[PDB]
DNA sequence: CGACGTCAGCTGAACGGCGGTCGTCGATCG
DNA sequence: CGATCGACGACCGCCGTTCAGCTGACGTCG
């Protein structure tokens, strides 16, 4: 059939607009959410390793970090209460987008599929 | 767990170096192979629609197209015999890379998983 | 220098927008004025021969003629002819076209103008 | 007397058949000579600006240009060795027609008259 | 002398192509 | 690790090109 990369690509092409439209009314972009979640799971890290874990340039991560400081999400930076709440609601919303693309599969199919994706990386 | 985009991303991050290392000793990059396969499936296409289908800018596609002209792969462009043979061998090697990443799954698991991706992609 | 046709052309290209912009606030185009003046000089002419004298097709001339009937300038019932309003319109049209003429010819002195017009009228004849 | 436009018209109506009969045994029409002379004075010009300077539509100018290509007159087109000579002889015959209409004026009258036309033309 | 069939020739719209413009990413030193 | 310099690459205006749609001009006619 079609190359594996093509299929991953098409699933990504379905997923990313949904995640974008979902994050949009929260005042968040996709990279900003990435940063949110990284700092929410690993508090305290500096900007450089943030950029290293998200495969972006330090300047992009600093732009994001300033947008999040100005928004009162972050204060060797770390998260604040507003940042935690924002992270929660963002997480929930992207999970909703996830459910909405994964809905073409039955629930068992979903579980097994996530196991398989989990395995193919690792 | 982890967001769907993260998992898709990690699988892509496993696959892309593999397809790169696979295409490398054929003198092909990944976009050049994309162009190859596109023209191999739909001969005659012009530069604009070539670029439209691969989600790239027309100038990138023109760079790729002239690089393929210089190699005697392409002649409203279309493929040559050398281009067809090259396309076949390329197909084969990226499919080998695919097999090599998909190998962590059993064969039935592989088939089922690819069915699942094919469905999840609209 | 440049061919005579080029020069005649450039003078025409200066003149025609002037006569057009001049005829415009009277509700007249250039062919309509041509027809007006023809009928003002030779009343009674038919649609066909009107078109023959202006080097245009009969259907175009009938278009202008229908416009001039609707405006109360001409009465056709082949042999068309002018009305009072049509003659007055023809008069002021004449005057305005003469004003455009004066405005392009003004780059020349008056004797130069007279002599030049003699010269053009001879080259045709 | 008669409106100025009538006079320009009558002189044009005398001149144009003469120029046509003059250009005819050279295998040239009037627009072809126009294009020829334009390229003879300004080599290199493209078809669009050629048509734009001659007050014609681009398709007419392209018709003329392909006719002059077939005759080995033109090659952003430009003139050829045959085209330059053809342009010279064309210039000459059109100049002869000019002389034939202008002959109704004395030579000083001719010179002064051409001074007057050039002045009246913006 | 009008009228109609036939069709070449002109105008408005979308496509492909290309410059000026600037944001953004590697490569250095501090 | 943060900063700057140098330059490749992506948006985006205008220009040339094309085709659809149609009003105009010849070549028959009663």
């Amino acid at each position: 059939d079609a190359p594996l990369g093509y299929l991953l690509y098409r699933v990504g092409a379905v997923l990313r607009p949904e995640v974008s439209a979902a994050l949009s009314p929260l005042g968040l972009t996709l990279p900003e959410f990435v940063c949110l979640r990284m700092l929410s799971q690993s508090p305290g890290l500096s900007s450089a390793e943030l950029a290293r874990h998200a495969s972006v340039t330090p300047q992009a991560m600093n732009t994001v970090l300033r947008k999040l400081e100005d928004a009162g999400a972050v204060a060797p930076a770390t998260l604040t209460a507003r940042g935690r709440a924002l992270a929660k609601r963002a997480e929930a919303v992207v999970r909703a987008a996830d459910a909405r693309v994964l809905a073409r599969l039955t629930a068992p199919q979903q579980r097994e599929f996530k196991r398989m994706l989990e395995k193919l990386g690792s």
Side-chain angles (χ1 to χ4, degrees), chain A:
Chain A
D1 40 340
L4 181 62
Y6 279 46
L7 305 185
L8 277 75
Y9 179 79
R10 290 191 68 185
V11 182
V14 169
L15 177 61
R16 135 170 53 251
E18 284 275 328
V19 172
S20 290
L23 280 171
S24 165
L26 279 74
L28 302 171
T29 67
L30 207 148
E32 294 158 6
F33 168 65
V34 172
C35 179
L36 256 64
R37 176 173 228 268
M38 271 190 309
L39 285 179
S40 157
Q41 287 189 296
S42 317
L45 339 101
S46 278
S47 181
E49 56 269 27
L50 273 38
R52 286 184 195 100
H53 289 77
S55 298
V56 297
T57 63
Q59 58 182 358
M61 187 59 62
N62 282 41
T63 306
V64 168
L65 278 176
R66 185 68 64 176
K67 171 268 179 300
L68 299 176
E69 290 189 19
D70 298 356
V74 288
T78 176
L79 249 51
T80 195
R82 176 153 156 189
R84 305 165 203 149
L86 186 66
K88 171 176 171 182
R89 298 172 298 195
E91 194 69 13
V93 136
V94 54
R95 291 334 237 279
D98 286 350
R100 186 156 51 259
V101 37
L102 289 178
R104 287 193 163 191
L105 302 179
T106 71
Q109 279 174 0
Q110 286 175 45
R111 297 190 283 267
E112 179 66 18
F113 173 78
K114 283 174 57 179
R115 293 190 55 212
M116 282 172 335
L117 280 186
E118 167 180 353
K119 200 161 182 292
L120 285 148
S122 183

